[PDB]
Design a protein around this ligand. Structure first.
Ligand SMILES: *SCC1=CC(C)(C)N(O)C1(C)C
Ligand SMILES: *SCC1=CC(C)(C)N(O)C1(C)C
Lengths: 128, 127
């Protein structure tokens, strides 16, 4: 698939500004005010969305655990495993999802995917 | 992949008793005071999963930190390197899709089962 075209098409369809998009190969980024950017890229034949959050302190993670666990248990139907995945590295808590092939061919459908992913980002940002 | 042969052979190799396995499938490994380990070929990939009774909401709140730490734990044998936690009405389900490198060998696969069981033990301890 042509991911730049899919993404640009998704973003005018929902009336997003064009200035938020930055880009030959991986990856595409969408800037958001006071939020981590959404990264999009073809990763081994599948469209992948991810967001890097500054790793919370261990104490903040404990106090926010219940809320974060509820977020991670929420179904994400566009995902190959029907979940959003949370990955931890030394520096980041990374939200990650691999999108099903059925949803990467239509810019209108893909906009709803990006918007639901953003909503998940919003909830996580709220408790960090 | 002959999954029945892989599993039986994994369990001999670590001296488990043969009484604990039952069954094309899925195959169950019964363990005491705990959910069984279910194993099956699901679209060409070996999948392991364990069904835990959905905790009450208050219990989830008091165990959330321990359950979050468990899920953030690296699981190197997984395709996405995590153990996934799935919620259904009746169950909190631990799930992993095992990666090809680890499913041709009964000796290697026994270690995958053992690490998976360890993750089940940690979750059982806070539910
Ligand atoms: S218009 C900015 C925007 C982009 C996208 C990721 C699709 N969103 O959820 C909003 C609407 C915030
Ligand atoms: S011997 C019982 C057993 C089976 C398996 C799931 C492989 N295990 O981790 C133990 C050793 C508990």
């Amino acid at each position: 698939i042509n991911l730049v075209q899919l993404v640009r098409d998704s973003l005018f369809t929902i009336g997003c500004p064009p200035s938020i998009i930055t880009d030959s190969h991986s990856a595409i980024t969408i800037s958001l005010d006071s939020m981590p950017a959404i990264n999009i890229a073809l990763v081994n034949e599948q469209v992948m969305l991810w967001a890097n959050f500054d790793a919370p302190s261990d104490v903040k993670l404990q106090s926010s655990a219940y809320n974060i666990l509820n977020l991670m248990l929420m179904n994400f139907s566009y995902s190959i495993n029907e979940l959003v995945e949370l990955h931890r590295s030394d520096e980041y808590l990374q939200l990650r999802v691999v999108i099903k092939d059925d949803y990467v061919h239509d810019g209108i459908v893909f906009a709803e995917i990006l918007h639901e992913f953003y909503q998940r980002m919003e909830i996580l940002n709220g408790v960090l």
